[PDB]
Fold:
Amino acid sequence: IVLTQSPATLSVSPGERATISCRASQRVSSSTYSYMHWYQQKPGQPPKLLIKYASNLESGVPARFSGSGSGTDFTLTISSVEPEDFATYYCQHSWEXPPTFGGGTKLEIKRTVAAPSVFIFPPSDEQLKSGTASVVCLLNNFYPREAKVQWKVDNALQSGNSQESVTEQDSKDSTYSLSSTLTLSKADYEKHKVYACEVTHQGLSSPVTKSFNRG
Amino acid sequence: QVQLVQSGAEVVKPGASVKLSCKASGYIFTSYYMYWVKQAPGQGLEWIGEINPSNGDTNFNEKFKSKATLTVDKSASTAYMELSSLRSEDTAVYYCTRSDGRNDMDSWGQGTLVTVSSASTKGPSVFPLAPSSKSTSGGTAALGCLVKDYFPEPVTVSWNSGALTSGVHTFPAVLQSSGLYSLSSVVTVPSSSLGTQTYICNVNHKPSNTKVDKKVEPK
Structure:
């Protein structure tokens, strides 16, 4: 049995109703009961059972979740979305062997524009002792996700030797955070004076620079 | 409380086997089926098969019947899955999950990431990201730990043994040019209490059996 979930992604504001679908390739209901189940997977966590046999709320799960449907066509509804509902939602049937799962719907949570708060970290003295210098620039709690970080060393734009990583949406405030790390040899690090992280984001009217002088 | 605790992430050489465990507590182990489920990176979920812990009866997905071997130790309340002849397509998070009726799967282990690779396991170095004048903002201070040069994934980071979770961001790993991973874990706190509170990151890399606690202090 193939379970097809739609839509792929759904973007919703807190307080609004969310509705997602799961279609089975064939019937997964008897004449009385339906053998479809729904799970929620938050980042880094295993899937969590929300709804069983199409419409039975799992004990402990909040009342905003419901499920419905019969035959082939099933729905999960969040009546009023909370930011902690950021997750991927999967359906799963238990009609025949083997049980199978749909491809998931990713729920994204809309929120207002928030500029990043920018912090910079010189290399630790420990790390420098080992021959390498990592300079970390943190962009914290911003939205939307689009942001640009450039490194400047003695005002010169750096062309490589950095890497970035972005978080998933926060479960409480729906923001993103981003780290950019500039990595140099101790020798290369010590030939320059000023290290700067320059940050562009739509919640800022001009780029924000955080810098420090080596030492 | 029903709990399923799985064994730690490991790297496996291509062609080799690995045996994963799943320790059950808080219920009668023999009264529920144990399922195992695969989730490939970015991918979705695939049922591997089932074991009845009362008697050792199994059933498998035809897709996994040659790949997976299921057993139990009833006195240790532990289920096992041995994956054979491992290839690249086998790199994935593997879950154990209990099913009361072979319908829904109501409690899940935390997952075991099995990385199939010829590369060797390496433990991370941990360095502080000290709060300083260059890491403040409107009454808040940011601080962290850089976890550098490990393989394979994952690393976990807690703060103050799990008591500090508000405002913690543990970034997704990046792949370095070396083929080793790196990530940072940061947290924002009141700048007022930098003198009086203690911040320790607790880094765990299970594949290398490496644990590092680093107290992060003002610069």
The radius of gyration of chain A is 24 Å. DSSP finds two helices and 18 strands in chain A. The helical segments of chain A are 125-129, 186-189. Chain A has two domains: 3-110, 118-214.
